[PDB]
Symmetry: D2
Subunit: 395 residues, 4 copies
């Protein structure tokens, strides 16, 4: 008995029966280092949206989902730290724990788990074949390495809405803020008010930023951010970002900027916001970040976009105003979040009431049968982070 969300072509996902998990890798070799989880909570990601919209090279039939929190039901013979019944947060990265990059804390780019390229992840295009976890049950390989044990079940269940964000979005937003150099007193600009943008804004606040400005083209997502105490920039109005920031800060620049949009970026302005223009965020962040600043880029950029705007963009080439960044001495930091690097201290923050992440990103808890509908609302721009409770454990 297993089931989950399956990708079936542009705009299409459905809940299907799927195989119960097996203690083997995606090439069918047996493994001793894995566990099988009964899934407690499992979220929908903006990355999942890229795939569902037909924006990647994903195969039809892909089981989706890489934001898992779970409870051990089966343990492979080599696993030392796990017991049946243990609650765990699963980092979205599949990492081996023994290669050059895993050992150097670069668990987003594991050298062994994916025959095609460095880096692995559950239910995710080009990520080594590991089955996704928007499902009733899921296999986690290298369990001793990857898993974050949650505190006593009671206190954990009590904050599950928060803890479900440790799998992907909070550590990601956090990595965005830290690589952009955010610290106490920083002025911060955040591109994107989606779940990831909002997590970067929360992270920046937690890191002690003086002021945090969140930008989007979506007015409902900005209203959400504003109700959460952040400053906003509306990129659908005709007033340029520079001008919006200056009205707020008294200069047209920030200390730190985070790109939480990626390759489906829209342009700015009345008509610009209705046009896809994937270099937009990059170019505008070079424009607003002060000299010697750092740009953090958690937003996803791909080597291949079948639906992209032009030949160059189909192959991940953007028209980027690099001379500007260079003239401003900017440095840029990119790539999949190494979730494990931050997830334990972020847990401490949640448990100690330092960060109300669930309120901030607008967590909504849904049934597994509502998942397709959840994707639909998410696609239609709702200011929410959808959390699937597939066994009805806490809803």
């Amino acid at each position: 008995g297993n089931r989950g969300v399956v990708y079936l072509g542009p705009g299409k996902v459905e809940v299907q029966n799927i195989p119960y998990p097996k203690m083997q890798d995606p090439q069918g070799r047996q493994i001793d280092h894995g566990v099988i989880l009964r899934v407690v909570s499992t979220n929908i990601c903006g990355s999942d949206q890229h795939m569902v919209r037909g924006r990647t090279t994903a195969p039809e039939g892909l089981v989706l989902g890489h934001e898992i929190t779970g409870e051990v039901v089966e343990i492979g013979r080599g696993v030392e730290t796990m017991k049946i019944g243990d609650l765990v947060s699963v980092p979205f990265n599949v990492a081996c724990g023994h290669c050059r990059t895993c050992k150097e804390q670069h668990t987003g780019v594991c050298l062994t788990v994916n025959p095609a390229r460095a880096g692995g992840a559950y239910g995710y295009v080009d990520m080594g074949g590991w089955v996704g976890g928007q499902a009733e049950y899921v296999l986690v390989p290298y369990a001793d390495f990857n898993l974050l044990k949650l505190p006593n079940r009671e206190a954990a269940m009590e904050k599950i809405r928060d803890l479900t964000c440790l799998s992907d979005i909070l550590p990601t937003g956090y990595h965005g803020a830290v690589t952009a150099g955010v610290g106490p007193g920083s002025t911060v600009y955040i591109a994107g008010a989606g779940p990831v943008g909002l997590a970067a804004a929360a992270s920046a606040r937690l890191l002690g930023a003086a002021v945090v400005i969140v930008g989007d083209v979506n007015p409902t997502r900005l209203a959400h951010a504003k109700k959460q105490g952040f400053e906003i920039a509306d990129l659908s109005k005709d007033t340029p970002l520079h001008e919006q920031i200056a009205a707020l800060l008294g200069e047209p620049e920030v200390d730190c900027a985070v790109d939480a949009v990626g390759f489906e970026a829209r342009g700015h302005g009345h008509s610009g916001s209705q046009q896809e223009a994937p270099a937009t965020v990059l170019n505008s962040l070079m424009g607003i970040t002060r000299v010697a600043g750092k740009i953090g880029i958690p937003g996803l950029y791909v080597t291949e976009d079948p639906g992209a705007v032009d030949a160059a963009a189909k192959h991940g080439a953007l028209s980027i105003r690099f001379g500007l960044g260079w003239a401003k001495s900017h440095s840029f930091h990119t790539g999949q979040t190494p979730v494990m690097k931050y997830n334990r201290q972020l847990m401490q923050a949640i448990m100690w009431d330092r960060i109300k992440i669930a309120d901030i990103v607008g967590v909504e808890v849904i049934t597994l049968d509502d998942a397709p509908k959840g994707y639909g609302e998410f696609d239609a721009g709702v200011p929410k982070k959808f959390v699937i409770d597939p066994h009805n454990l806490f809803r």
Copy 2:
């Protein structure tokens, strides 16, 4: 009075009589903090070549040169640590010493010395109208802050050909290597076998790199790099860069990469290399740097190139394969070198024979009258670094 190298329009320089330096800034306000130097040695740079070629917005009449070594002949009334006769290395950055960026060692982007933008330099486009120093005498403002005191004059003069590199190219090459993450045992690729690239190679050697490979489309420069003990990759051949690297290393990746080419980049291959393609280096570096690696970009890129290949490149926009670097978790480091942050320890290294920079870059000493001829030769691609001795002090 004084005389020096003057730019007269695309491809034209000549030595002219010019005013003796005055104790005032480019706005004509008196300064108490400056010194006037008799110029001992003064170098020709690839940056100078960009301007001479008419590839920047540099005006006719500009006095050239930002790589100065001198002797103090006059000091302003507020200068406390400099005395007459003192022999000094001058960082190419003009920096104030008291703004936010100068305090934080970002002295390539001083916020007060330039009304146009952050950052200053001598005889350099968009760099605040500080007068160039390919000349007999030159003004250095903020002398206590900027100047590097050279060792008792005998010892200094005997290593003049080396120390003349401290003003620009050695610290610049060094910046590129350290921001690319080079250290003991690193494998390193450097694009560009011009003097800056050779300084980057020298720096990586100093740092204890396991192996250093220098790439260029100009075979006579690669011959020179090879005779200095470096590995080479010839981009004018049709053999792809990753294949030349694998033949040297046994894998197609380096740990660290440095872009010492900048915006006049040629394409790769027999015919590709005969044509300008400004994004080529950046794209190639993402291709051969290993995941989670760092890319150092000392090479110059501009916000405006009058003679660029395309409308986009005229504005500093390049077709960059960003999605590739993003998928490899690359980080990118850019901009004008903070020369002061490294010049002291590099001088130490020079004085203790840990680095034979003059040999590595191919230093050649010339008379001031020979400057126009030297620019011609350098522009034609000879494997040399031209050092002007305007008062015939050591030649």
Copy 3:
């Protein structure tokens, strides 16, 4: 007309007429780089107390005070950035701005301003003879480099009780926390609930620490810390520090520990707390900081203490259980805070209401005539930070 707080021997200070400041250094040479301030607010520090208790080699007649906020009334001819009437925060460190340590942001240890050793500061033993500023007027040398310009007078004056802490204690407490490695999610122990200890605790809250525990032997300072939302360890109880921490956290250790006591440390327990044992804090921090942790030590330790417990301590030797910290792989960070490294970002934090520093440290505003009484109360251990308003400008 000038007057200040003067040190007159163990336990003794009085307010005296003193010379109006002069544009010369402590050796009587004219300087062009200084300003004179009309003092707006000027604070009493724990460092001042060491000196008043006769615990240092401070000479009788020392004019005290290194915590200055002021209004420019005079300007030396070399000064570029200052105007009469400007409101400024004065970092307690006297720094030149052009030596090796000043350039690398080590402005607590300037090489040029003190003939006796590295590092200068106002009204401070062994700190170069710069006159103190617990006075109506004071000289600030190297004004362009050292001074922090405050916001429109009106907004600045309104937050004076907060901003006055930028001269010394907030940056210091901050340096304590950052060098101890504090970050989002940290568990933090801070030794000392004095104004500096409190600033460290505030800094740790601002840095996003999960839980902050402040320890002291003083019951009244702890009741004040507890009112400000911090956890407490009462070292006057017989319950050892381990046990109090473990009761609080469920393990007898913290990620990060800051020493905000210094060389007049008391031992632990009913009677231990009435004994001086200068090694106490260092040894107990090594006991409760987890493996590979960092210990930040802002608390002052001296080369000479005329009033110490024994021979060894009079020369700054302590019996330190180094083997313990070594076995735990601890790192240690020490010395005068480089205030300029942090003050600007801290000002932004204050102006944006991210840190209510005045309330936390218990700012109390007094007249210059009440200063001796202030010293008295401070010495008796009141949980307050004394701020003198010498011209009655805001009180």
Copy 4:
């Protein structure tokens, strides 16, 4: 079929027959993650000497040796990257690869492999009861995480004298130098011309230091250091170290200082050097390191020393002149080397002839039966590093 070096009480070691390795931990539990090695080379360490001299709480019967290079002859059933015949470097830390410290690269203080405290190592006091490897065969647990693969056996054995240093002393010396802040152009002082000190000196050279001065009380070691091209300081002479340094550099300070002596430190001077004084090195490093400088302390300090000079030292407590370090703003870095952090890039530098470590540390190859003789000669202070070749594979 196995034997090795067994400790029998103060001053006494002998070769005995010992059990063949079993695939279990020191508690007798079965493990699937280990491999068994035929030992190729296995070294004698100063750490071993501490124990043999009776200066630790090490038990009679302890099998010695933590510096192993070997070939895999048997693999556990869960091992994924090791094959029989594989030739490997063993880091001396026993590390699990799944706990908090292991993941953060703090593999010197693993939290799971040792019931007594954090940190594990082979045949080493308080290090988890993992059996030592000056033996014919040895167990390495967590093989996929811990082992460093060496290349074609042929190229590897030709450099075996160098390669055998990667297990312990080269990465130790390297850790000491990097944490002392050593970089291109650094001036460095290293206390101790034992093998570890010599490896720090080699490291500092590799890292590009301007000048490296090694001190010792043992002149036969200093003769060796000088022959290896380093500067020396003789601490058995009455000339104070700061004067010896000034003679060499023209100032009495260094940029970086490394303590490669540890808890059996001798005093300085004709008579001082003849007596044990365990605070001596730490105290003199604070004396000669420049302000804001960093002190690396790879030398061992213990929480309990049975034969220490006084009551306090038996407990790991030293009379440290901390006031002086504090006034100079020193940082201090301590503890067991995380060998995995550095071993990969040091192997690269060895294979590409960037460091001739075996020559520098004075490697001498001996039989297993001659081990007691090696220990004796090493204790008499010869300038050599003993490498045991148990199966006569390359001697």
